[PDB]
Curated annotation (Swiss-Prot), chain A:
Belongs to the universal ribosomal protein uS14 family. This is Small ribosomal subunit protein uS14. It comes from Escherichia coli O45:K1 (strain S88 / ExPEC). One of its GO terms (cellular component) is cytoplasm. InterPro entries: Ribosomal_uS14 (IPR001209), Ribosomal_uS14_bac/plastid (IPR023036), Ribosomal_uS14_CS (IPR018271). Pfam families: Ribosomal_S14 (PF00253). Part of the 30S ribosomal subunit. Contacts proteins S3 and S10.
From Swiss-Prot, chain C:
GO terms for biological process: translation. One of its GO terms (cellular component) is cytosolic small ribosomal subunit. It comes from Escherichia coli O45:K1 (strain S88 / ExPEC). This is Small ribosomal subunit protein uS9. Signal peptide: none annotated. Belongs to the universal ribosomal protein uS9 family. The gene is rpsI.
Curated annotation (Swiss-Prot), chain D:
The lineage of its organism: Bacteria, Pseudomonadati, Pseudomonadota, Gammaproteobacteria, Enterobacterales. SUPFAM superfamilies: Ribosomal protein S10. InterPro entries: Ribosomal_uS10, Ribosomal_uS10_CS, Ribosomal_uS10_dom, Ribosomal_uS10_dom_sf. One of its GO terms (cellular component) is ribonucleoprotein complex. One of its GO terms (biological process) is translation. The gene is rpsJ. Pfam families: Ribosomal_S10. It comes from the Bacteria. Involved in the binding of tRNA to the ribosomes. Gene3D superfamilies: Ribosomal protein S10 domain. This is Small ribosomal subunit protein uS10.
From Swiss-Prot, chain E:
GO terms for cellular component: cytosolic small ribosomal subunit. The keyword Cytoplasm does not apply. The lineage of its organism: Bacteria, Pseudomonadati, Pseudomonadota, Gammaproteobacteria, Enterobacterales. Residues 38-106 form the KH type-2 domain. InterPro entries: KH_dom, KH_dom-like_a/b, KH_dom_type_2, KH_sf_prok-type, Ribosomal_S3_C_sf, Ribosomal_uS3_bac-typ, Ribosomal_uS3_C, Ribosomal_uS3_CS. Belongs to the universal ribosomal protein uS3 family. One of its GO terms (molecular function) is mRNA binding. Disulfide bonds: none annotated. The keyword rRNA-binding applies. GO terms for biological process: translation. Part of the 30S ribosomal subunit. Forms a tight complex with proteins S10 and S14. This is Small ribosomal subunit protein uS3. NCBIfam families: rpsC_bact (TIGR01009). PROSITE patterns: KH_TYPE_2 (PS50823), RIBOSOMAL_S3 (PS00548).
Amino acid sequence: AKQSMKAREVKRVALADKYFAKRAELKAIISDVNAASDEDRWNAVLKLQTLPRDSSPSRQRNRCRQTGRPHGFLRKFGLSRIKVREAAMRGEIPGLKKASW
Amino acid sequence: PRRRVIGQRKILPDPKFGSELLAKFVNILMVDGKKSTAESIVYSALETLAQRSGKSELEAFEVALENVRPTVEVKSRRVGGSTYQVPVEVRPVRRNALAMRWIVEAARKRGDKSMALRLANELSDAAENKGTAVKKREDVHRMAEANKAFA
Amino acid sequence: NQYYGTGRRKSSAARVFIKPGNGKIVINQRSLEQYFGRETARMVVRQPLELVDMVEKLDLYITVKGGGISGQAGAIRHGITRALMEYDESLRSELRKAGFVTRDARQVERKKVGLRKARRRPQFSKR
Amino acid sequence: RIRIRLKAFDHRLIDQATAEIVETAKRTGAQVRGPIPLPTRKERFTVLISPHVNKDARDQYEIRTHLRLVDIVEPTEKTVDALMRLDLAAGVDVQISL
Amino acid sequence: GQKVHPNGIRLGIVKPWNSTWFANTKEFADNLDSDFKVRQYLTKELAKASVSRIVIERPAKSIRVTIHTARPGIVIGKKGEDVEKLRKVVADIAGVPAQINIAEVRKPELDAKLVADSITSQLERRVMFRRAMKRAVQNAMRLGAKGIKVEVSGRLGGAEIARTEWYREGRVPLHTLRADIDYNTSEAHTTYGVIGVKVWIFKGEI
Amino acid sequence: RSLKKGPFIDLHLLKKVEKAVESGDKKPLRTWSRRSTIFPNMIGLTIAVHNGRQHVPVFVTDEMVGHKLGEFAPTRTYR
Amino acid sequence: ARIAGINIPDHKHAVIALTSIYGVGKTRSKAILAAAGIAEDVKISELSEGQIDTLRDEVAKFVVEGDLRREISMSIKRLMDLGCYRGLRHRRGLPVRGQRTKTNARTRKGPRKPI
RNA sequence: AAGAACCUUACCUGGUCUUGACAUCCACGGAAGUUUUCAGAGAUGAGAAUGUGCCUUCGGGAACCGUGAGACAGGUGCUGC
RNA sequence: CCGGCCGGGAACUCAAAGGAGACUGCCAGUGAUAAACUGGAGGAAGGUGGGGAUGACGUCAAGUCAUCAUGGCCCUUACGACCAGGGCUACACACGUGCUACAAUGGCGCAUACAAAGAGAAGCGACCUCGCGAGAGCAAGCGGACCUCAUAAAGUGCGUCGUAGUCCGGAUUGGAGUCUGCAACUCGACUCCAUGAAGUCGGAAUCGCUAGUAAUCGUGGAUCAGAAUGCCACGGUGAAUAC
Ligand SMILES: [Mg+2]
Ligand SMILES: [Mg+2]
Ligand SMILES: [Mg+2]
Ligand SMILES: [Mg+2]
Ligand SMILES: [Mg+2]
Ligand SMILES: [Mg+2]
Ligand SMILES: [Mg+2]
Ligand SMILES: [Mg+2]
Ligand SMILES: [Mg+2]
Ligand SMILES: [Mg+2]
Ligand SMILES: [Mg+2]
Ligand SMILES: [Mg+2]
Ligand SMILES: [Mg+2]
Ligand SMILES: [Mg+2]
Ligand SMILES: [Mg+2]
Ligand SMILES: [Mg+2]
Ligand SMILES: [Mg+2]
Ligand SMILES: [Mg+2]
Ligand SMILES: [Mg+2]
Ligand SMILES: [Mg+2]
Ligand SMILES: [Mg+2]
Ligand SMILES: [Mg+2]
Ligand SMILES: [Mg+2]
Ligand SMILES: [Mg+2]
Ligand SMILES: [Mg+2]
Ligand SMILES: [Mg+2]
Ligand SMILES: [Mg+2]
Ligand SMILES: [Mg+2]
Ligand SMILES: [Mg+2]
Ligand SMILES: [Mg+2]
Ligand SMILES: [Mg+2]
Ligand SMILES: [Mg+2]
Ligand SMILES: [Mg+2]
Ligand SMILES: [Mg+2]
Ligand SMILES: [Mg+2]
Ligand SMILES: [Mg+2]
Ligand SMILES: [Mg+2]
Ligand SMILES: [Mg+2]
Ligand SMILES: [Mg+2]
Ligand SMILES: [Mg+2]
Ligand SMILES: [Mg+2]
Ligand SMILES: [Mg+2]
Ligand SMILES: [Mg+2]
Ligand SMILES: [Mg+2]
Ligand SMILES: [Mg+2]
Ligand SMILES: [Mg+2]
Ligand SMILES: [Mg+2]
Ligand SMILES: [Mg+2]
Ligand SMILES: [Mg+2]
Ligand SMILES: [Mg+2]
Ligand SMILES: [Mg+2]
Ligand SMILES: [Mg+2]
Ligand SMILES: [Mg+2]
Ligand SMILES: [Mg+2]
Ligand SMILES: [Mg+2]
Ligand SMILES: [Mg+2]
Ligand SMILES: [Mg+2]
Ligand SMILES: [Mg+2]
Ligand SMILES: [Mg+2]
Ligand SMILES: [Mg+2]
Ligand SMILES: [Mg+2]
Ligand SMILES: [Mg+2]
Ligand SMILES: [Mg+2]
Ligand SMILES: [Mg+2]
Ligand SMILES: [Mg+2]
Ligand SMILES: [Mg+2]
Ligand SMILES: [Mg+2]
Ligand SMILES: [Mg+2]
Ligand SMILES: [Mg+2]
Ligand SMILES: [Mg+2]
Ligand SMILES: [Mg+2]
Ligand SMILES: [Mg+2]
Ligand SMILES: [Mg+2]
Ligand SMILES: [Mg+2]
Ligand SMILES: [Mg+2]
Ligand SMILES: [Mg+2]
Ligand SMILES: [Mg+2]
């Protein structure tokens, strides 16, 4: 699903784990209802944009691992709805038989 | 069904008037599966009917249902090619069920105030045969009597 | 001493205990009159106690959970018929011929894939 | 006491795993209630079967996660050491809890 | 196209899951991706070694891979040197330890992967698709099969229009879940295009 | 509308406005931040917001304050 | 039954009577009758004149009728003078709150037209 | 499409880059990194500090980084006839 | 102290595993001395019990080269690649599929009873305490038969409106906000306040549905930072009709 699109997703994952899985203090702790409400809260949202545009975990699309398909994803398997089926009825996802109730 | 002759489901009697005739009347009156609302209306109607008519409930409902009951109804059958109006003797199970539907169908219209009031008035007018339900049987007869030529 | 019958009409599962004594019917620490109000039929639980008379013979302590109104009321009807086993086959000859002891399995059909709800297909566009 | 809880995907791999862990405890140092079953988790998934269009056509899957308990009611010295370093049974997760 | 995967429908009943491990919802996804990384790698590396399937287990952070194969001597090599070379590189991408085991298969013509990989390999060497297909169908019935359906879809013979052609010899009851049917597919990348090769091998009734 | 914790402007647009206001009136500021709100100090400036394919000059008045910059730069053209 | 600009209802409960005022809804009306000290169940015919004058000063607190109509007309006319996206939306006769304008929009756009 | 504010995004506008964002090599220089400043819409370009490790053929290493060179990498471009 | 709270119990519901069971197996016609058909007992269930999965050879050179793989073909200072905006949400109009309606078997208030299924670690987030309310602070427990989202709603029971474009509808807009998020103007969701449109049952046509089904009420999940009237599941009440 375009090698560039898969390759730009590794920036988004690596660069997010660096900054905002650590520097959420800038948004969470500082922008809060307490004594820092004056210029300290203004300097937080000011300094939050100094960071790169990527890093925010909202900007990760979350696509299939094997192919890179953006749609049809499943968080349990980490796959597309096509590749989970290809892998399930084959013997790769443990315990995953056809349901019928 | 093409060749699948199977019988019908059994029904239940209504607690306060343990029977069958008016138990089905509740089902025809019902909308959206709300039997609690519908059954409260039929009791309310028959209690207001029994006060005015000066009879019981089963016999008050009977002397009312029989006055809107069809004897013969009109189907149309193409045996050979053409399309004409063939009257036929209605079956005893459908006979009273077809009457119940005409009482309720007339009660949808004729917007007095309450559903309990409207049924009570329709069944009261059915007793002295001058409602809309008796008119709907009267026309059904006229088709059968006029088109009696066809067997 | 103290006889028992289960009953479990439609998801709901009754638990009917029955003893020889008063005519009262206790249910989940509530009276039968106040627990089952105006809904459709209170006396579906008392239907099985007609061919075999109650009046002031058998007292009923019942417990039930699951389902709604008629699911529980019908589960009690089966629970009582199952519970009436103190005179084994003398009662069940007359009781079965009016239905009653038949479980009545019919549960809600699952939602089929593609269909909007069990049987309801969406619509049809033919151009 | 030690509440031992274990779960698996296969319903008939966990049975011998629960039988062996009870027997390597009951026989070696006494005491066991039994295999308490617990409710089975059924994580269903309803993926589209086709690669393009055909919303009506799907395949529905599930993964039965079968739980089991053991429950011993005395911290025995022979039993507590036999639980550790002596489990094995591949494809069967186990979590001892004091 | 409208037929269910014959392996997939029998996974609970007759056939076994190849990846046999439990995992909690957090790890499951990454544990399944690492499972694919070794399987993709180990299939491409051991090409001439003739591998049918790869069973993978994970008891308490220890990846026991199994390699079911027709030619076990080529997988091990001399003095189990290639097992140690596999054990190292597989253990890096997967997750810490490794325990590679090898299961021989004395009847290689009854395994669906090996028959399909044989036909595929033959198609790439300009062999006539019928002389590859029917020879595989005839060869495995003599040994001890009861079914052997074999489809070959694609261009085949350098044709303009594509055609699917199948030959079977015996009972191949696909709708029977009690029946053991080895099914597998493989892709023959010829000069004219891809040629798919499905194979069903009904061995036993239960 | 959103945001109680400080009306929002981009760092680059704030520092460009503060530098422009202290110096004096000059020319349209090429700015792409449509998202950014308008401050009282911006009144008088003719900043040019990016509509999509070009920059639209917007003379900021007393009223244009609580609103955002992209409101005065229609993107899609019709008839 | 003559409070504010208009309010002339009869045979109607007090809470629903005051909904007839522009600028007074259902919840606002209950705040009037709570502060005034009047039961919601009563109607204006049943009320006395001594109680109606207390309602007049109560609704005088809130902006109602032409005070409100002008406040709304000012705010809409303000937007159109700015020439903002909402203003362009208003004068063009098209829906404002980021709505779908392709299939529906009939309330703001009006009834159907020829092509 | 099992979910378009940005991302997704394949489209447009303008800015931009050509062994390239993603890969193994032939080899030149450096641990990797981390903190932090300036011009810019941002991509980017310019810095300033600190740190300077697992083996010694010690003209080298096994990774990582940034140069020049080509084998090339890349294409959600067309063809489901 | 009066709540499965308590020791305790291991009956029962439930939970799983391992199993019995239903086969025209049994009787009675009918059939042709057959298959079988009808009807009957026993039975929880009766003639494939209900439901699901399972889709023959092949058809439409059906769909997909944009999931992936893939032969050729074209592009390689651009048809490749990084970035800010914008756009995919445009709107004289036409259709498809829904939802909410047009009310009185109904609308709004107060008294309060009955589910099933699923979900959860940068998670789900109690009791609290602030708020008219979205929510906001402090934090309890739970990788769960325990802890939490979570009071199910139709349903009763009282009240009040009495057939009005209405106390029906709740569109559309103005203002004031809340959360998520680098960011909510293009272009989010929800909340409050005011606002109060079309609509009085729908032309020719026409669709689904044979019982826990249609109808109708809520409920959950997947994708998902946020963003369902869709999709996928779950249970409430529960009909009519089949000559
Ligand atoms: Mg690719
Ligand atoms: Mg996202
Ligand atoms: Mg049929
Ligand atoms: Mg079900
Ligand atoms: Mg659909
Ligand atoms: Mg269609
Ligand atoms: Mg049409
Ligand atoms: Mg047509
Ligand atoms: Mg096919
Ligand atoms: Mg299918
Ligand atoms: Mg133009
Ligand atoms: Mg008003
Ligand atoms: Mg309001
Ligand atoms: Mg919108
Ligand atoms: Mg962009
Ligand atoms: Mg360009
Ligand atoms: Mg083709
Ligand atoms: Mg085709
Ligand atoms: Mg096409
Ligand atoms: Mg062609
Ligand atoms: Mg005990
Ligand atoms: Mg016990
Ligand atoms: Mg005991
Ligand atoms: Mg027991
Ligand atoms: Mg027992
Ligand atoms: Mg079992
Ligand atoms: Mg037979
Ligand atoms: Mg016999
Ligand atoms: Mg016989
Ligand atoms: Mg005989
Ligand atoms: Mg005989
Ligand atoms: Mg005989
Ligand atoms: Mg005969
Ligand atoms: Mg005879
Ligand atoms: Mg005879
Ligand atoms: Mg005879
Ligand atoms: Mg007989
Ligand atoms: Mg039959
Ligand atoms: Mg059948
Ligand atoms: Mg069946
Ligand atoms: Mg079946
Ligand atoms: Mg069966
Ligand atoms: Mg075609
Ligand atoms: Mg492709
Ligand atoms: Mg295309
Ligand atoms: Mg080529
Ligand atoms: Mg070539
Ligand atoms: Mg292109
Ligand atoms: Mg679209
Ligand atoms: Mg729009
Ligand atoms: Mg939208
Ligand atoms: Mg509807
Ligand atoms: Mg409503
Ligand atoms: Mg209501
Ligand atoms: Mg209303
Ligand atoms: Mg209201
Ligand atoms: Mg709580
Ligand atoms: Mg709460
Ligand atoms: Mg306080
Ligand atoms: Mg409060
Ligand atoms: Mg909160
Ligand atoms: Mg709260
Ligand atoms: Mg759970
Ligand atoms: Mg709770
Ligand atoms: Mg919820
Ligand atoms: Mg719960
Ligand atoms: Mg009037
Ligand atoms: Mg009007
Ligand atoms: Mg009004
Ligand atoms: Mg009108
Ligand atoms: Mg009108
Ligand atoms: Mg209608
Ligand atoms: Mg007509
Ligand atoms: Mg509703
Ligand atoms: Mg819902
Ligand atoms: Mg969720
Ligand atoms: Mg819905």
